[PDB]
Homo-oligomer: A and B are copies of this chain.
Amino acid sequence: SHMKFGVNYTPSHGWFHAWLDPDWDGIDNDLKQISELGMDHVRIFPIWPYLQPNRTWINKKGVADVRRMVHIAGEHGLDAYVDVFQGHLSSFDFLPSWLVTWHAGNMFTDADAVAAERELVKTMTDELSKEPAFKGLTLGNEVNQLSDRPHPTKMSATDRQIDAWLDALLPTAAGEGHNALYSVNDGTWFIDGHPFTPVQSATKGDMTVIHSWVFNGIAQGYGATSEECSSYALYLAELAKAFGKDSERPVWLQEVGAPENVLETDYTPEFCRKTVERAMDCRNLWGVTWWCSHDVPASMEDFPFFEHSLGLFDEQGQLKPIGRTFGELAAQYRSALPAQPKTVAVVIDVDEAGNPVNRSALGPGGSVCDLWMKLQVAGQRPTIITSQVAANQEALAQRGILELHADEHPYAARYYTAVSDPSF
């Protein structure tokens, strides 16, 4: 109610290859057991080249199948959030043939590609809005990952071109009864020069969307069981909301998982409990969506190995100890009062547009992450503001902030790694 709990839905039979040969009875079983765990929403992932296999030709059956999965979620009392441009899923890119090889193009800056993306967003929104359970459209999953290094076939863009891309697409996703959003990996906050920016994340679309993954150096550098690692989803929420103009703008922890390349298997339920409990201490947090509902079938290869076991349900569809934990967290917290305000803040220097001067210091083991972590471990409950708020006595009073901590001696993120596997 006050806090949303849900899952990123990975079809148990077929994964996202289910869209080619869906087992609708198994999809209904998946969604029923998600609902029985006490989840109130799912996030769903169609595949872009199946929806739009030619720039000007949309596969109506593929759109209808997304609508059916939304409908099935709503039969079991789940709200459904739908991402469009996949695009990127668990190390794989699914790109339309009209954007690759002989047709290599830039999905962010080519006018024809942006027009086609807008047509697909409009088509999806118009059809999915016929289901009361459809509650939001996310332009796509971690859409920034194609825009910069280390992507091997990047579609480069400036941050002004990404402003224009977001502004070209998000209005088409709007409509009565649902949200419009996009999502990014954490290079948005941690990579200097990256064209998806913290100011965009905290101003474009309806909520500030983050995906929290401690295999990015948090677990390795601070220690898997450390308080810092447990507090990282909170850190990312506090960090991402700091760059918005609206101090009350909600934050959606749209992915958080327990990756067993850096966590012990028997620790993932405790990791889940501590991570969610700390994330809830961010008063702007709107919801927590765990990655993911169901394990990735073992017979499917070339995933980074730990991805297979990120489910709350195992491959036999049996609820795992972490799933039991996450259901209990939802029962305990879905109606809780919001967190108390925070009078202690870490200050991040920003440029005129509001973006950090030094993003490299925000990542795992960077000076700003270390400073925030130090205060958080010391029980000081720090929030985060920019230098533009710190310089303005009225902005500080509006926020009830009393004590500021600046980064006196900045340094780059000593632990950060931008990929999910040493493979990459």
Contact of A297 with B57 at beta-carbon distance under 8 Å, contacts A93-B101, A97-B92, A101-B152 already known? yes
Q: How far is the CA of A91 from the CA of B101 in the complex (A)?
A: 9
Interface 9-mer from A58-66, A326-334, A366-374, A382-390: A58-66
Count how many chain A residues have C-beta atoms less than 8 Å from C-beta atoms of the other chain: 36
In the bound complex, residues from chain B placing their C-beta under 8 Å from that of A103 are 91-92, 302
Which of B53, B55, B98, B102 is the one whose CB lies under 8 Å from A152?
A: B102
Please tell me if the beta carbons of B100 and A91 are within 8 angstroms of each other in the complex: no
A305 near B: Cβ within 8 Å? no
A51: nearest residue on chain B (CB-CB)? B20
- In the assembled complex, how far is the CB of residue A119 from the closest CB belonging to chain B, in whole angstroms? 12
A101: nearest residue on chain B (CB-CB)? B93
In the bound complex, residues from chain B placing their C-beta under 8 Å from that of A49 are 49
In the bound complex, residues from chain B placing their C-beta under 8 Å from that of A50 are 20
In the bound complex, residues from chain B placing their C-beta under 8 Å from that of A15 are 54
- What is the 8 Å Cβ interface bit string for chain A, positions 76-112, against chain B (1 contact, 0 not)? 0000000000000001111101101111100000000
A266 near B: Cβ within 8 Å? no
Contact of A59 with B17 at beta-carbon distance under 8 Å, contacts A102-B424, A152-B101, A153-B101 already known? yes
Which of B20, B92, B297 is the one whose CB lies under 8 Å from A98?
A: B92
Q: Which residues of chain A in 20-62 are interfacial with respect to chain B, using CB atoms and an 8 Å cutoff? A: 20-21, 49-50, 53-57, 59-62
Q: How far is the CA of A347 from the CA of B21 in the complex (A)?
A: 54
Please tell me if the beta carbons of A17 and B53 are within 8 angstroms of each other in the complex: yes
A151 near B: Cβ within 8 Å? yes
Q: How far is the CA of A95 from the CA of B102 in the complex (A)?
A: 12
A300 near B: Cβ within 8 Å? yes
Q: Which residues of chain A in 370-424 are interfacial with respect to chain B, using CB atoms and an 8 Å cutoff? A: 424
Please tell me if the beta carbons of A102 and B91 are within 8 angstroms of each other in the complex: yes
A299 near B: Cβ within 8 Å? yes
Please tell me if the beta carbons of A93 and B104 are within 8 angstroms of each other in the complex: no
A352 near B: Cβ within 8 Å? no
Contact of A62 with B301 at beta-carbon distance under 8 Å, contacts A94-B97, A101-B153 already known? no
Contact of A299 with B57 at beta-carbon distance under 8 Å, contacts A100-B100, A101-B153 already known? yes
Please tell me if the beta carbons of B97 and A102 are within 8 angstroms of each other in the complex: no
Q: How many copies does the complex hold?
A: 2
- Which of A21, A55, A56 is the most central at the interface, judged by chain B CB atoms within 10 Å of its CB? A21
Contact of A100 with B95 at beta-carbon distance under 8 Å, contacts A56-B300, A62-B20, A300-B54 already known? yes
In the bound complex, residues from chain B placing their C-beta under 8 Å from that of A104 are 152
Please tell me if the beta carbons of B55 and A301 are within 8 angstroms of each other in the complex: yes
A303: nearest residue on chain B (CB-CB)? B54
- In the assembled complex, how far is the CB of residue A89 from the closest CB belonging to chain B, in whole angstroms? 9
A154: nearest residue on chain B (CB-CB)? B101
Q: How far is the CA of A61 from the CA of B297 in the complex (A)?
A: 18
Please tell me if the beta carbons of B17 and A54 are within 8 angstroms of each other in the complex: yes
Please tell me if the beta carbons of B100 and A93 are within 8 angstroms of each other in the complex: yes
Contact of A57 with B300 at beta-carbon distance under 8 Å, contacts A62-B21, A101-B151, A152-B104 already known? yes
- Which of A62, A297, A301 is the most central at the interface, judged by chain B CB atoms within 10 Å of its CB? A301
- In the assembled complex, how far is the CB of residue A107 from the closest CB belonging to chain B, in whole angstroms? 13
Please tell me if the beta carbons of A20 and B61 are within 8 angstroms of each other in the complex: yes
* 13 CB < 8 A contacts A-B: A15-B54, A17-B57, A21-B59, A21-B60, A21-B62, A54-B300, A55-B302, A57-B299, A93-B102, A98-B302, A100-B153, A101-B152, A102-B152
Q: Beyond A20-B62, A21-B60, A56-B300: 15 further Cβ-contacts under 8 Å?
A: A15-B54, A17-B54, A17-B57, A20-B61, A21-B61, A54-B301, A55-B301, A56-B301, A57-B300, A92-B103, A93-B100, A94-B97, A100-B100, A101-B151, A153-B153
Binding site for B on A (CB under 8 A): 15, 17, 20-21, 49-50, 53-57, 59-62, 91-95, 97-98, 100-104, 151-153, 297, 299-302, 424
